[PDB]
Design a protein around this nucleic acid. Structure first.
Length: 290
DNA sequence: TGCGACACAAAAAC
DNA sequence: AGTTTTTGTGTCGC
């Protein structure tokens, strides 16, 4: 009834079928590592402004809630939350040096203002985009919002246990404990060590995330989870790393900038999950029906 | 047909 | 140790 896999950090992922077993909402058994991501492709090259060195990049993503590995399929539930976290790494650049440097996109052409992640959901069979929604912990008693683009600096991805522990922290002392894991506070650095053109100082806000954490995420309530043949639709979650550049023939989205202008989120790399099955609200998807 | 809205309840958080 | 918070899901109805 429960299949157990050991995670990288020594925690377990316990996969079970909610059609057969009902577990409490806050049980640690609800936390588990989801399907592994794979490279879709690399897009625009990035180089350091003076040396011309190509910046090697790698997205480091993981799902920590919402998906079970059941009989060779990865299964989620329309009504339930998933958690998707990601960082990125720069193999050839240590963080301290990276933040003092400046980078251009090779279309030295366009100056990178900052790096950022976005997530998307798609129908894996035809590439149609599917809307995602997020809630706050207050759920129906708070606002609903779409996942946003997250400015980020390179960092190792926290272990599954750390994401679990930081999922519902309110206590100030505890939050202080995790602060350095999740944020870089630009306002606390020695400004004299940085040039005006440094990458750190073109980030849009002083509080800069080290990890993109998308919690309390759901597929849009109106998604159809079966095909007309009654077969299950296959979905996929995508993570895209981009460089945000000033608007003033390569893949990019438009971004409602901070200068109040129309920025450009230029794609650098994209990863995706294998096909995912999403179970709808039908009573037959729940153990209660048995 | 299935969904928005409200309800219940169980373990985490403090 | 007791109270509040969070979230899977049961249920009513439009």
């Amino acid at each position: 009834v429960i299949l157990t896999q050991l995670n990288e950090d020594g925690t377990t992922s316990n996969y079970f079928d909610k059609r057969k077993l009902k577990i409490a909402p806050r049980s640690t058994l609800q936390f588990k590592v989801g399907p592994p991501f794979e490279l879709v492709r690399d897009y625009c090259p990035v180089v350091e402004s003076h040396t011309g060195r190509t910046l090697d990049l790698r997205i480091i993503p993981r799902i920590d809630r919402g998906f079970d590995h059941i009989d060779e399929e990865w299964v989620g539930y329309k009504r339930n939350y998933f958690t998707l976290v990601s960082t990125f790494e720069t193999a050839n650049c240590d963080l301290d040096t990276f933040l003092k440097s400046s980078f251009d996109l090779l279309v030295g052409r366009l100056r990178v203002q900052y790096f950022a992640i976005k997530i998307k959901a798609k129908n894996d069979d035809d590439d149609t985009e599917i809307n995602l929604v997020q809630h706050t912990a207050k759920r129906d008693k708070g606002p609903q919002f779409c996942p946003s683009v997250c400015p980020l600096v390179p960092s190792p991805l926290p272990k599954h246990q750390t994401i679990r522990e930081a999922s519902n922290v309110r206590n100030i002392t505890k939050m202080k404990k995790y602060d350095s894991t999740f944020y870089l506070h630009r306002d606390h650095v020695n400004y004299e060590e940085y040039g005006v053109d440094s990458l750190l100082f073109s980030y849009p806000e002083d509080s800069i995330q080290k990890v993109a954490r998308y919690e309390r995420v759901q597929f849009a309530s109106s998604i159809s989870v079966k095909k007309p043949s009654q077969q299950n639709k296959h979905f996929s979650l995508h993570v895209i790393l981009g460089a945000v550049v000033d608007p003033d023939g390569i893949p990019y989205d438009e971004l409602a900038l901070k200068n109040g202008s129309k920025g450009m989120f230029v794609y650098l790399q994209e990863m995706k999950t294998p096909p995912l099955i999403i179970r709808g609200r039908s009573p037959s998807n729940y153990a209660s029906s048995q």
